[PDB]
Amino acid sequence: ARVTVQDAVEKIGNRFDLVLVAARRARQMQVGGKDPLVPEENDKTTVIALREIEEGLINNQILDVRERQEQQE
Amino acid sequence: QDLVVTEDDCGTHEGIMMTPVIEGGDVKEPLRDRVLGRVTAEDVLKPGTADILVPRNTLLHEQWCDLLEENSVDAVKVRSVVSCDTDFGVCAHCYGRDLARGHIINKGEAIGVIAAQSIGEPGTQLTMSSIQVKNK
Amino acid sequence: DIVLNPLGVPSRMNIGQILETHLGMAAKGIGDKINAMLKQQQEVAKLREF
């Protein structure tokens, strides 16, 4: 469900929201310097982002809450 | 090029009643095919006007039209894009389902370009006393 | 030497491609038989007759 998203659709909701979250996550991993926990088995960064999305622990509302918390400090 | 699915549901009630094209004895397409993926503007009724088969707000899928065939439905009225009460675009339900995804059409899909391509492409495949009943 | 699809023959209707192939096989067979006779240093009369 990485190249073609079926399972993560029921894990991220709207696929336009999926595109937006993927773009934001790519720009963050490129500039924010967040240290991931998934070992790198010669995999693309977008692939790891899709894996973390299909995990279902990060969504748009939680990202907005974290953005507000970060802008507070 | 400028036509884009811009809204979700206009709630219109006008539409087109459709019968299968018959030239002689044969039937060109079943009711199922021409209603497949469409959106009804009313409640489809079982013959005998007693029961409501399907509600008007549901997306007519393969299962629903199979049930209609089971009930032997005669004619359906569906929300077409011609009778869509939307300004500057077409809502999702007047255009029926996306023939390439299987779900409902999302807002912002240029169906006009899709329509133009889907009509033009087959163009390369294009060229250049009494009536009798034969059925019981 | 070359592997060809037999599926392109019926739709494209170029059947001379098959008769020419059979005739090429026959011609190369006669050539190989002449080659066999020449490797044997056979008499000129044998080659004349064949």
Partner: protein
């Protein structure tokens, strides 16, 4: 040969002045189309049948294993008309105009 015999007979009638130019033309096209259909019928059936000696020693006719038949009936590549052209007869052909 039967098609040739019938067109010769209709030509004899025309020499006797029974039919007209257009009617004879249409009738001959019709009978040649009928000969084409008969040739296709006697071709496709002879191309889909086999005589297979069964375990009992008797013959159980089955679908033929011919390669061009496999191509046609399988729908892998080729149609019935193409097989008619390469194995039966090409059939009626068109003039530079619409006329056959």
């Amino acid at each position: 040969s039967e098609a040739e015999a019938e067109v010769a007979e209709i030509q004899e009638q025309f020499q006797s002045g029974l039919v007209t130019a257009g009617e004879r033309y249409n009738k001959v096209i019709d009978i040649w189309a009928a000969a084409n259909d008969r040739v296709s019928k006697a071709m496709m059936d002879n191309l889909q049948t086999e005589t297979v000696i069964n375990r009992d020693g008797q013959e159980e006719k089955q679908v033929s294993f011919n390669s061009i038949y496999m191509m046609a009936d399988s729908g892998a590549r080729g149609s019935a008309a193409q097989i008619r052209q390469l194995a039966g007869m090409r059939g009626l052909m068109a003039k530079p105009d619409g006329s056959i």
